[PDB]
Each structure stands twice: as C-alpha cells, then as structure tokens.
Design a binder for this molecule. Sequence first.
Ligand SMILES: C=C1[C@@H](C)[C@H]2[C@H](Cc3ccccc3)NC(=O)[C@]23OC(=O)/C=C/[C@H](O)CCC[C@@H](C)C/C=C/[C@H]3[C@@H]1O
Length: 447
Amino acid sequence: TGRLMLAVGGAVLGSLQFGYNTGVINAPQKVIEEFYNQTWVHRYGESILPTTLTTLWSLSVAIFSVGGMIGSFSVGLFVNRFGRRNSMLMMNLLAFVSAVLMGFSKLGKSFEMLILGRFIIGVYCGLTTGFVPMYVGEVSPTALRGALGTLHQLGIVVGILIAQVFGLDSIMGNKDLWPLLLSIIFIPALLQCIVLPFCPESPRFLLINRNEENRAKSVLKKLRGTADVTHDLQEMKEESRQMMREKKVTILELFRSPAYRQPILIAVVLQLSQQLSGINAVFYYSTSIFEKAGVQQPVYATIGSGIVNTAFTVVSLFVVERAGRRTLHLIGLAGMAGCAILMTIALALLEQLPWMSYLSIVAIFGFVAFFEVGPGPIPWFIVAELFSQGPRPAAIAVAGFSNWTSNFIVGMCFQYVEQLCGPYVFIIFTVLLVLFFIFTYFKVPET
Ligand SMILES: C=C1[C@@H](C)[C@H]2[C@H](Cc3ccccc3)NC(=O)[C@]23OC(=O)/C=C/[C@H](O)CCC[C@@H](C)C/C=C/[C@H]3[C@@H]1O
C-alpha cells in the first residue's frame, strides 16, 4: 500500500498525457489555423481557401483518432511479449517523437509534421489506454483494485482540464507558444521514463507469461508490503483458471456465431451512442462553438466545461455502485438531448436576444455533465457484462474499434456539418440521441 503508490501513480501519467492530448487542440484552434494560412501563403503566394482550412485542421485533430484505433489493437501485442511495465516505458518514444514533431512544426513551416505528430501520439494514446488499466489491475490488491482503477478515468478528465488551462492566451494558447503547448507532453514522458524502471513488473506477467514464479514472489512482498503472500499468489492462479477455463474466441468468430450476433449489436451501438452524441464536438471545438455564440472570454467557458466534466466524473463514481446501468444510460441520452435542444435555442435566439450566449454555456455544461453519468462509463460496463471470459476480450476490440471509428466521424465531419446546418447542428445530435434512447429502452437489458 506504500510502495504501491509509486507504480500506480507512475502509470497514471500516461492517462494524464492521454487526456492532455485530447483537449489541447480546443482553445488554440484559431492561432494554429492562422499558422496554416501563414504557411500556405509562404509556399504558394496565396491565402488558403476557407473550406480547405476546414478539412485540413479537421484532419489535424481527426487523424489522432485513427492512431488510437491502431494503438488499441496493438495493445495485446506488446503486453504479452514485452510485459506491462516495459511496454509503457518503451512507448514513451512515440511521445518524444510526436512532441518534437508537433513542436518544431512551426519552425519547420509544415502542418504535415503537426498532423503526423498528431497521428503518432494517437497511437501512443491508444496503446496507453490499454496499458494503464491493465497494469494497475494486476499490481493492486483485489480490495483496492475496485478503487485504484478509478485513477485512469480521473487522469483523462483532469488531463483535459490542464490542456484547457494552458490553452489560455495568458499561458501557452497563443501565437508564440502554441508549438510548446503541444510539446509540453515531453515532460510527463520524461518523468515516466524515470519513475517506471523503479516500479515492479506485474506479477501476473512473471507468474503466467514467464513462469518465473520465484521472481514474482519478490514483487508482491515489497509491493503488497506484506511479508507473506501465500494467498494473493494462489488467488491469481485461481483467477487464471476462470480466464483459461472456457476457450477465448476471435473477432471474426464473434460475427459468424448467431449466438453472439445480438449482444455485439448492443455493444457497438452503445459505443456509437457515446460518440454520435457529440461530446467530442465540444471537447474539440468548445472554444469554437462558444465564439459563434456571443460568449465573452470563451476559452474560460471551455475550462468551465472541463471542470464540470471533471466534477461529474467523480460524481459518477458514487452512482454506478448505487443504480442500474440501463437507467443511468437512459438519463444521459435524455439530458444530452435536452441540452442539445437547449443549445439550439441559444444559438438561434442570440441574434434576437444578445445574451443567450450565457444559455449556451449552461446547456453545454449540462450536455457534458449528463454525459459523464450515462453514456460515459456505462457503454464499457455493459459490454464486459454481455460476454463471458471467452468472447469478452474480442468484444472489447470491436467496441474499441466502434468507438474510435465513430470518434473519427465526429471530429472530422462536425465542422463540415457546422457550415451547412448553421445553428441547427445539435439537432443531429438530438435526433441521434433519440434513436439511441429508443434503442436502449427496448433492446438493452439491464445488468
Ligand atoms: C471521449 C472519450 C473519453 C472521455 C472516454 C469516455 C468516457 C469514459 C470515462 C471514464 C471511463 C470510461 C469511459 N469513454 C471512453 O471509452 C473514453 O476513454 C476512457 O475514459 C476510457 C477508455 C478505456 O481505456 C476503454 C476504451 C479505450 C478506447 C478504445 C476508446 C476510448 C474512448 C474515450 C472517449 O473517446
């Protein structure tokens, strides 16, 4: 419990860095867009086209999700081959590579570097979100396993907040220091590169994946702190039974078996309902949507959304263990729909009532607050509770693919939709939120 605080906190750095890379490109949108325009002129002696500037900066934020897909797929590769700890350590290379790329992108007069860096760091984020939850789950005692695993969640939302803070004009969200805003991630990396080597390899890797039972003994005693461990050791060997009991099934075997075709449908749709709700429409373009509203100091409203977001995350902890998954997920979609509607009213009546800009802030706060209690965590609780230890692994990969894919559809196309639909964009979210509300009220069983 003492030395334990090192290995965990050392791993959560990746989840901080995960959330940081997610929301850094929110506030400094205009300045980087100005840099694209600046770079476009220097090359061709011509101001960039507005539609091109759209899909270009959209690609710069969207390509990140593409990396995450690949990353989340490759987690199984490095984990069982190089170990949990060492996997997290070596993959800090992607951060330094990406940090340098996104940092010297301005000094290199190239948005390709920035896009490329955004891809690479996306892979790291996809890999990391597979490492951290798995590492702490094996390192922590079973008692604190259902509590320390929270730090991954908190890490992301807090990382998103810090990204939005630094996104201020006062700090790093400006003409001169935006390349550093993207690069500062090297600090967390450098820290994790120092800490992890002192942290212990997971015993479940030493006991199972290496059969080095003896090398695992020295871990738990220093790790768990307890002198003896002739019960935690037997535990893992008894929990590995259930994990090795029924045969694990592959991805494409999940599609072909009509026994698995119904629960998988629920899983994927529940992931679509998380992204196509359009919470990344705000976590990527909060400061942008606020600008089209009459919001004074919009970057602060984004930080507001971060704090509200971070807040209701902690609230959700003391709710999932108090209510049902079917209910909480329904509550979310409704509130997200209501707020999406309420958002449209603000964006519509602003031109008539020069103050509804304040309503848009409250709407989006509720739009993300209702998300973090319903469609936030639940879509990952239902999937893990619709499949036994055999097909459950393959189900996460599909769900993971479903999430990244639908995440890319929003972040890449939301601006193209924002131009044509005008103040009537959140209706798309409202509409889909209804379909997702119908789909769950009938076809989603409580667990
Ligand atoms: C906006 C988002 C962010 C906010 C989350 C979103 C909400 C959430 C928050 C806390 C716990 C579980 C879910 N639900 C997510 O899953 C979330 O990433 C995670 O936080 C955890 C991801 C796990 O590693 C498994 C999936 C890891 C990836 C395959 C998918 C990651 C999704 C992101 C999502 O983009």
